[PDB]
Design a protein around this ligand. Sequence first.
Ligand SMILES: [Mg+2]
Ligand SMILES: [Mg+2]
Ligand SMILES: [Mg+2]
Ligand SMILES: [Mg+2]
Ligand SMILES: [Mg+2]
Lengths: 145, 71, 140, 103, 313, 211, 183
Amino acid sequence: VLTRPTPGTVQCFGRKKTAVAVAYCKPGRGLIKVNGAPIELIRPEMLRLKAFEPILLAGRSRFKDIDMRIRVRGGGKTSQIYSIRQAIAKSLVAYYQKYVDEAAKKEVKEIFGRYDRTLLVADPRRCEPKKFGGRGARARFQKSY
Amino acid sequence: GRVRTKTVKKTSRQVIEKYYSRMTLDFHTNKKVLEEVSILQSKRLRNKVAGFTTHLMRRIQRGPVRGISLK
Amino acid sequence: STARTVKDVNPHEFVKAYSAHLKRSGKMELPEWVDIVKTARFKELPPSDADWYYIRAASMARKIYLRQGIGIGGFQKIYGGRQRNGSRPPHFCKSSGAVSRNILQELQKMGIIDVDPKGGRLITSQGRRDLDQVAGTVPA
Amino acid sequence: VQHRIRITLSSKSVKNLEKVCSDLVKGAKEKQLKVKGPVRMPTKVLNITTRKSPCGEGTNTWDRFEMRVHKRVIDLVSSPDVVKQITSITIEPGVEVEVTISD
Amino acid sequence: ESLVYAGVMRGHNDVVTAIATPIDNSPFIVSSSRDKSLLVWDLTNPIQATQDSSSEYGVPFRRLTGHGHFVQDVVLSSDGQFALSGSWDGELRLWDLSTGVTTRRFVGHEKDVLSVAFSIDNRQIVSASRDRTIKLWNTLGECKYTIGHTGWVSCVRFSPNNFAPTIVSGSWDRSVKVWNLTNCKLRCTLDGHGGYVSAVAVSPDGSLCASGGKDGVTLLWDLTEGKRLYSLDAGSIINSLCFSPNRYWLCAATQDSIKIWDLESKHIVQDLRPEVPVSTKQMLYCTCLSWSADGSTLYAGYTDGTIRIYKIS
Amino acid sequence: TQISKKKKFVSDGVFYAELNEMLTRELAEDGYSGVEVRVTPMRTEIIIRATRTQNVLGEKGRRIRELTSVVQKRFNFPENGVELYAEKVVNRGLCAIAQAESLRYKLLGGLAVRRACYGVLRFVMESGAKGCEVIVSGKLRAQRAKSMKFKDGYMISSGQPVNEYIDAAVRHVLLRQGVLGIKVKIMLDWDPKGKLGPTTPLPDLVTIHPP
Amino acid sequence: GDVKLFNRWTFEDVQVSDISLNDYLAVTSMKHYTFLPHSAGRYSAKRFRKAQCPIIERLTNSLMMHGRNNGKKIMAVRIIKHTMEIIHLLTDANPIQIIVDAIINSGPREDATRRQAVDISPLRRVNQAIYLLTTGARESAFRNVKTIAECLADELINAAKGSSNSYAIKKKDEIERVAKANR
RNA sequence: UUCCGUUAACGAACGAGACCUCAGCCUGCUAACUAGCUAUGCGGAGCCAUCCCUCCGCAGCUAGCUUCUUAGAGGGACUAUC
Ligand SMILES: [Mg+2]
Ligand SMILES: [Mg+2]
Ligand SMILES: [Mg+2]
Ligand SMILES: [Mg+2]
Ligand SMILES: [Mg+2]
């Protein structure tokens, strides 16, 4: 009851707009890949630090015993990175909750929360439908007199 | 603007008027008994009646109200 | 180091290394229309890189490595982009099919990519080996 | 039993289609036949958008009409006899039942 | 003879609904909350209160997040590796505390489940719901006889005596009913409450049965004879009732304070009250009382999600 | 032979919309209320709801067989693959099409409009509708056209419950001076058995059980 | 020093001089330290929530102009990085301190509404500072060989010193003057 | 014309809101050979062989499962708490 369980597997997803990234975590040696390629290669490159933020904050030492395989689909080139971000963060939090004690989870979750709640909670913002009478959701056709 | 309409307010005072005894100070308990002493046609309208019922049920404890609450 | 496959290396560097590999191998025969054609009709100039043929060969070799079953129309869509229509709105356009077919046939005449019965082109074991053994030489 | 039966159900209404599907999967589970389903296909949204004005005057206002087609697939393993004995109950109007025998 | 504020633990962010304790004095506890989760507490190294404003009488060890709505009652197994948590989503889950996953879902209740109870031998399971029915189960998720009341059956405790297995039942119909498990019929309707019976409790010897709720008066009856007895009067609505394991006490979690009553003198020995500092939490009361197996520590679940421990000194 | 599931549901809808039009034009003075298509495995049974169910049947069912054969050939059914029944509209007062046609013939004859519209209102309210409304638009008396509303009872106009509680029809009278319009809106009462009206109570309606 | 802008520049040693403009530049608190000037944050739901947005991000968002550059925030972040490197090259100091000094020495403090001279609130002060800085950099870059990053670096460096060679400072001076003439 | 409050008005009704649809949440439920995941087996490549590890392909209605996809049922917010 008060003993750590045998390290196993968790699968966690993150979302931004219509992009979904799902991280499969298994006991390993600290490998992190997205769609087969290593995360240290994710693009755009100037949003690479955004996806590295959960690792840079939880520390690369907290990822030694897990291998992170992430599949991301949908969205665009920014929302996919923001989805991979949240998938990594939520996957580490869930892995520490089932196989690494609740306290350590609480600490890593507190770090993630103080940095950004988007790391753990998805932004609920979606495109607003277009209305007839304009070319956009709010924009209306130019009026003459 | 979160102003409750008459249907929510009227139902709240009628529920407290009859079933004051089986009405607690908690929204989640009040919305369960509201399903047992009433037939409301929406979850959204049932929640608004129980949230205003809880609101009134706490002002009764304060002491002044314009219902009846004979007690 | 080595033991790095294609899905371990930066694509911009892998394509540049494999184009040099292909040019060194000397098993690529270039058409007469290499310095004339455009890669697509929406293009307004021929490719500015003299080794663009080998660069495109490396690009399609890598694409066939990562995916199986790409046809000539699929590669026309892959290398197609935005067409600017003068005073009219831009739209998507497809690439040239002759270039894709000729380069893929040149890559069949090396045992790098074969053609699958299910349609398109597959990567051969020799082609997989070649791309994987070049990926290990790519500096990290 | 022996063969493989795919019953496709389509409708414009969710409740009638779902209760027909429930009847089918309940009958299948009473006769001890294994049933894979109901499997809900993505809903088809037939959309028509037209100018409400019968002429060309006024604010160009558009009404968007929708017809939603809901498709359900049930996969039993059995013989044709039990399949037509099951799909003989009162199928509600609007529900299009379709039985196809596979290998 | 008295209790002191040993410490406080915060692991739930919303009203703690139940606290189960191991029967074998294992150094953990299990607590449920309205945050839809169970929590096992590491109670091996308890940091006693230093008034230095920090520490945690216990560490949250393992969370159990399988239920879909408010978890309301959890009872531990006799072995201690298994937990049974009733939830408002209508099901009962059996959790392996070592692993942390559900081993059996108990479907059959249409409304929110309010009270669960393991038998003395962990063979039968009884649940109480808002459907006004008492359902008997097996450890294989099969529903036996489905016992009647005319309101929310709020509590159902297994009589700890074996001559005739008995399940009590307190309901929002303002009644207490004694059901014979052997025939799953009824024996005695213990009536006399002036409000919903939100809590019942049975003495360890299986003779005295406590009952409280909206009326604010705790009527202690005798199960064997089904006759009313002294009528201990609490301050406000009683949320929980529990008998001291070895000290012949009766603690009642009321909305004013936690009051312990010696049933010999029928007098109030103590009244524990949180040390909250402001009128912020205008209502911060105790919802679930829980004596440890030895009877030396009292665990109290409050409406803020905190748990306060009071050890006998 | 293979028809899409889209083309098929659009075809069933168009077939329903055309059948009802030809029945409206044919069984006009028979009190035709509506048609209920029912595609059974053996045949596509077609139920006709009318008020003069002896005028649509015809002498020894000649008219109904004529319609059954016309539908079979026109719509291209297999022979004996369509059978037109003819049932009784249960409550004519609670049907806006029946009352619209009744008010049509009550005005084609020559009766004063202000006396036939109130008669329609009377019959509807005795039938049991929670509210009824009649609109008569056209060259009623003078050359300039005006619209006379005849409302009595409780009638909702907005929201979703309208398309559950409001039974409405729109019919023309082809008079000597021009066309006269008839809008009949009948508001139904909540029927727990779902026969006289909707089974779902109005959303704003709240019932408190007495203690 | 775990969180650094672009993992290359420290936040701890940034001194926001003005006490007035302290709660409306989000640089000092550890909660406002970010790796990247890109957050996709919802800093517009409430009236005073854009004040709790990192100041480098607020500078970055003003580069997405005009319409031809609208929505192109990755290019704006690239401009910010290439500007912050030129700033470090030409000043040898922390570029975040140069940026906060420029935003401090650029926000007008008094204006003339209606023509009574009114004083500017801290939030409008920082908004005006950022708007003037990026507007001057953009107008310097337009139809010019000089890159928008170099023009932004020069404008920020001249605004940090207080020199009247920066479009923002010249314009701050005009604005406050008209509120001295029309006092 | 949403309520409160004042009051020769009180009590209602339409309209507004309620309602309906789409979107947002659910590691709970129901279920997938026209959706996937994970594992296993085999094969290919790498590393150098094999093994391991990594990236792939194929197969298994006796490989499990439903996180991701779908679509039904429900839950969920009430300004609830300060
Ligand atoms: Mg072709
Ligand atoms: Mg353009
Ligand atoms: Mg409305
Ligand atoms: Mg320039
Ligand atoms: Mg799912």
